[PDB]
Design an enzyme around this catalytic site. Structure first.
Site, PDB file in Angstrom:
ATOM      1  N   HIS A   1      19.986  59.315  70.224  1.00  0.00           N
ATOM      2  CA  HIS A   1      21.101  60.146  69.664  1.00  0.00           C
ATOM      3  C   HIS A   1      22.278  59.170  69.360  1.00  0.00           C
ATOM      4  O   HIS A   1      23.063  59.409  68.462  1.00  0.00           O
ATOM      5  CB  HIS A   1      21.556  61.213  70.656  1.00  0.00           C
TER       6      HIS A   1
ATOM      7  N   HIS B   1      29.898  55.287  74.294  1.00  0.00           N
ATOM      8  CA  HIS B   1      29.115  55.331  73.085  1.00  0.00           C
ATOM      9  C   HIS B   1      30.015  55.754  71.944  1.00  0.00           C
ATOM     10  O   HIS B   1      31.253  55.950  72.115  1.00  0.00           O
ATOM     11  CB  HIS B   1      28.040  56.398  73.200  1.00  0.00           C
TER      12      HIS B   1
ATOM     13  N   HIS C   1      30.099  58.008  67.942  1.00  0.00           N
ATOM     14  CA  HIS C   1      29.552  58.998  67.000  1.00  0.00           C
ATOM     15  C   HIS C   1      30.097  58.507  65.683  1.00  0.00           C
ATOM     16  O   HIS C   1      31.305  58.160  65.618  1.00  0.00           O
ATOM     17  CB  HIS C   1      30.110  60.409  67.291  1.00  0.00           C
TER      18      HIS C   1
ATOM     19  N   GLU D   1      34.191  63.307  65.753  1.00  0.00           N
ATOM     20  CA  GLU D   1      33.885  64.624  66.309  1.00  0.00           C
ATOM     21  C   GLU D   1      35.192  65.437  66.369  1.00  0.00           C
ATOM     22  O   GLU D   1      35.349  66.490  65.732  1.00  0.00           O
ATOM     23  CB  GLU D   1      33.265  64.407  67.709  1.00  0.00           C
TER      24      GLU D   1
ATOM     25  N   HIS E   1      33.747  57.255  72.664  1.00  0.00           N
ATOM     26  CA  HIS E   1      33.906  58.036  73.895  1.00  0.00           C
ATOM     27  C   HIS E   1      33.654  57.148  75.112  1.00  0.00           C
ATOM     28  O   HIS E   1      32.551  56.505  75.247  1.00  0.00           O
ATOM     29  CB  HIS E   1      32.860  59.190  73.834  1.00  0.00           C
TER      30      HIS E   1
ATOM     31  N   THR F   1      29.893  66.980  74.065  1.00  0.00           N
ATOM     32  CA  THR F   1      29.713  67.404  72.689  1.00  0.00           C
ATOM     33  C   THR F   1      28.251  67.208  72.329  1.00  0.00           C
ATOM     34  O   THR F   1      27.900  67.427  71.180  1.00  0.00           O
ATOM     35  CB  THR F   1      30.506  66.514  71.736  1.00  0.00           C
ATOM     36  N   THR F   2      27.385  66.807  73.290  1.00  0.00           N
ATOM     37  CA  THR F   2      25.937  66.890  73.057  1.00  0.00           C
ATOM     38  C   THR F   2      25.339  67.822  74.122  1.00  0.00           C
ATOM     39  O   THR F   2      25.944  68.034  75.193  1.00  0.00           O
ATOM     40  CB  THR F   2      25.299  65.477  73.188  1.00  0.00           C
TER      41      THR F   2
HETATM   42  N1  LIG Z   1      29.877  62.862  73.622  1.00  0.00           N
HETATM   43  S1  LIG Z   1      30.414  63.101  75.126  1.00  0.00           S
HETATM   44  O1  LIG Z   1      31.025  64.351  75.299  1.00  0.00           O
HETATM   45  O2  LIG Z   1      31.373  62.065  75.367  1.00  0.00           O
HETATM   46  C1  LIG Z   1      29.186  62.903  76.241  1.00  0.00           C
HETATM   47  C2  LIG Z   1      27.857  62.683  75.835  1.00  0.00           C
HETATM   48  C3  LIG Z   1      26.826  62.461  76.741  1.00  0.00           C
HETATM   49  C4  LIG Z   1      27.060  62.437  78.106  1.00  0.00           C
HETATM   50  C5  LIG Z   1      28.348  62.612  78.528  1.00  0.00           C
HETATM   51  C6  LIG Z   1      29.375  62.863  77.618  1.00  0.00           C
HETATM   52 CL1  LIG Z   1      30.883  63.119  78.262  1.00  0.00          CL
HETATM   53 ZN   LIG Z   2      30.334  61.290  72.719  1.00  0.00          ZN
END
Ligand SMILES: NS(=O)(=O)c1ccccc1Cl
Ligand SMILES: [Zn+2]
EC number: 4.2.1.1
Length: 258
Positions: A62, A92, A94, A104, A117, A196-197
């Site tokens: 992802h 990571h 997006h 996002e 993030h 958000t996943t």
């Molecule tokens: N995209 S996200 O909300 O930062 C997120 C994604 C995968 C696991 C933890 C988190 Cl906080």
């Molecule tokens: Zn994220």
């Protein structure tokens, strides 16, 4: 089969397996800059990343995660709207297929080219898996990226991506310093939200920085050469892995600044 970002398993499908997808505190959201309320009682954020220990980078199909050793208080977030100490576990991004989309969160409807993030968990809950089960279990620091000049402290990440092209590949990634990804200012918006996943748990205090970092065209180009599929599968480029803005409903966005 399982959730993704395609026409058949993308965000508008997630609610079928994850009904919380239509919940009360979903992320991301549009940040209406005129409607967010200055809150003079928020403290300065405290990012203490001097002692950070990165371990590994992985393509999980992802996005890619750069993972940290979170078994001691080595890289923590505190202050801002947070009570207590949250440890960095991973970051990571997006990003988009084109520079005009990818983030996002949006700002007055503006989409940025990508969004980082930095994911932190509340050490009163002892581990990440328990923290996500709590309304204040996670704190994610959101940083928008725009395309212009290169960010030198991102390059070490960009240069390892050839080695984790496809889902399930990982590579050793020690001694990476995430303070090289930060903008100069730490002004932020904050609201309560969610992953958000999937599983979209409503366990996050979102802390989204006002100031974007810029990265170069060639930098974001390297992100887009990643794959959602595993090795020896047909190539689906890893792009547009972002969930769109969700209804704000019964929430107020607070700003750390005027
Ligand atoms: N995209 S996200 O909300 O930062 C997120 C994604 C995968 C696991 C933890 C988190 Cl906080
Ligand atoms: Zn994220």
């Amino acid at each position: 089969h399982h959730w993704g970002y395609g026409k058949h398993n993308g965000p508008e499908h997630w609610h079928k397996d994850f009904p919380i997808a239509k919940g009360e505190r979903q992320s991301p959201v549009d940040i209406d800059t005129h409607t967010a309320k200055y809150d003079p009682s928020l403290k300065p954020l405290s990012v203490s990343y001097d002692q950070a220990t990165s371990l590994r980078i992985l393509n999980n199909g992802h996005a890619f995660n750069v993972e940290f050793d979170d078994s001691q208080d080595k890289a923590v977030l505190k202050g801002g709207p947070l009570d207590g100490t949250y440890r960095l576990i991973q970051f990571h991004f997006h990003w988009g297929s084109l520079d005009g989309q990818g983030s996002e969160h949006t700002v007055d409807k503006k989409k940025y080219a990508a969004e980082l993030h930095l994911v932190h968990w509340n050490t009163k809950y002892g581990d990440f898996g328990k923290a996500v089960q709590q309304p204040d279990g996670l704190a994610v620091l959101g940083i928008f990226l725009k395309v212009g000049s290169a960010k030198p402290g991102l390059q070490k990440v960009v240069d390892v991506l050839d080695s984790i092209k496809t889902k399930g590949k990982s590579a050793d990634f020690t001694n990476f310093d995430p303070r090289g990804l930060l903008p100069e200012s730490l002004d932020y918006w904050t609201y309560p939200g969610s992953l958000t996943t999937p599983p979209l748990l409503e366990c996050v205090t979102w802390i989204v920085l006002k100031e974007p970092i810029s990265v170069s065209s060639e930098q974001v180009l390297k992100f887009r050469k990643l794959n959602f599929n595993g090795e020896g599968e047909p190539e689906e480029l890893m792009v547009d892995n972002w969930r769109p803005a969700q209804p704000l409903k019964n929430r107020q966005i607070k700003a750390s600044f005027k």
